[PDB]
Structure formats: C-alpha cells, structure tokens
Amino acid sequence: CQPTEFISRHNIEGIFTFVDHRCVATVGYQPQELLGKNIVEFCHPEDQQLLRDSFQQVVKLKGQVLSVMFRFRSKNQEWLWMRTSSFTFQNPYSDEIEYIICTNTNVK
Amino acid sequence: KTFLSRHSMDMKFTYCDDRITELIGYHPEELLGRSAYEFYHALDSENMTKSHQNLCTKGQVVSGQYRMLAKHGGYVWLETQGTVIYNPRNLQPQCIMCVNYVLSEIE
Numbered sequence A: 001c002q003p004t005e006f007i008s009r010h011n012i013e014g015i016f017t018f019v020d021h022r023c024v025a026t027v028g029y030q031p032q033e034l035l036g037k038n039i040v041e042f043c044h045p046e047d048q049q050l051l052r053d054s055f056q057q058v059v060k061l062k063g064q065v066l067s068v069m070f071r072f073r074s075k076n077q078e079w080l081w082m083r084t085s086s087f088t089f090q091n092p093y094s095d096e097i098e099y100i101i102c103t104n105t106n107v108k
Numbered sequence B: 001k002t003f004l005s006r007h008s009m010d011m012k013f014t015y016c017d018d019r020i021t022e023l024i025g026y027h028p029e030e031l032l033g034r035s036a037y038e039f040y041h042a043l044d045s046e047n048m049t050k051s052h053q054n055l056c057t058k059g060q061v062v063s064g065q066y067r068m069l070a071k072h073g074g075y076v077w078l079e080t081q082g083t084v085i086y087n088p089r090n091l092q093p094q095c096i097m098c099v100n101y102v103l104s105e106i107e
Helices: A045-061 B018-022 B044-057
Strands: A006-009 A015-017 A066-073 A079-089 A099-101 A103-106 B002-008 B012-016 B062-068 B075-085 B094-107
Touching: A006 A099, A045 A066, A045 A079, A045 A099, A066 A103, A066 B075, A079 B002, A079 B094, A099 B002, A103 B075, A103 B094, B002 B018, B002 B075, B044 B062
Parallel strands: none
Antiparallel strands: A006 A015, A066 A079, A079 A099, A079 A103, B002 B012, B002 B094, B062 B075, B075 B094
C-alpha cells in the first residue's frame, strides 16, 4: 500500500511535468494522466482561483513552501479536502525557478 | 540545478527526484526503500544526523555543503535545505522535503 500523500514536478502554470507514483493511492489518478495537464483542471471550480493565487504567492516567496487547502478531484470525480504544499525550487547559482513541487497531504 | 529529496520514517529515501542520477548516480527508484544512512557520507555523517535532529524540532533548516557520497565513492559538495511537512489529520510529521542545491563538483 502507499500513503495518501505525494509530490509532483510542475511549472508555475501548474502543468505536471512528472508526477510521483503515489497519486494512485491518494486520489486514484495515474501519474501519466496528470502529465501535460494543469492542476487547476482537477481542482474544485470555486477554489481554482485560490489554487492559482497560492501558486503565484509561492513564486513571490522563491524558495519557500506554501500549503493551500482546497477540494481536489479524485479518480471518482469527487471533491476531497487536500492540502497541497508547493515549494519553489530556486537555482543556487542565479535567481531562477526551475520547477515547483506539490506535497498533496489529505486533510479529513 | 536543484534536486528534490524525500525522507520519511528513518529519514530514508521515500522518493528521489530524477535529477539525482545526474549528481550522485543512484537511480531515483533504487534509493526508494533503502536506508539513506547507508551512504550518508563518511566523515560528514555526523553533520547529517545533527542537522536531522535539529530539523525535526525546527521544521525547516538549511544544512551546509557536505560531501554527498556518490554511487562511485565520490563526495559531491552540495547544500541542502530541509522542510518537514506535517499531516493535517493526525497532526504528525509526514515527510521531509529536502531541496538540494548544486554548487560545487564531486570531490
């Protein structure tokens, strides 16, 4: 079995470049399904802006983790309360954000 | 470049970014389930333990450049910032998010 928590390498647009093989036990979605898709597409319509806003906040933080709590859509197309903690990977050489992760921790 | 390192339980590798194969040489899936302490440096192992214990009681801490043991007995001088995420249900340490920063080469 796998824990109800996973990460994914996504850009500032929420586009999943590579998802960790744990989402199957979290929401049931396959990593390849998120690949090339925006996190906002599987996010609660009324909380899509909340996600977007938080994503822009982490870009302003540059090297800090921001945890946003909303209702993510599972493989059952249901809305579950999940807290996504995103961290902006800042290049140690020069100021540059390579990618942003997303620690999806199920709440209740 | 940077590298995402996931550590849980005994601070082992729960998940490793694919970029680890470009620095340490160890395949991301190969570290999955193996003890990190096994290759936790040689003389810089204390540094990891000390920072780990401190991190677990601080939440987020930055570990200085240490000699990261590669898959060929090499020591990559990389800096790493760790952030322990907590579970919002049972309120307990979930997984440690370690952001590795590539600065120097391999010793």
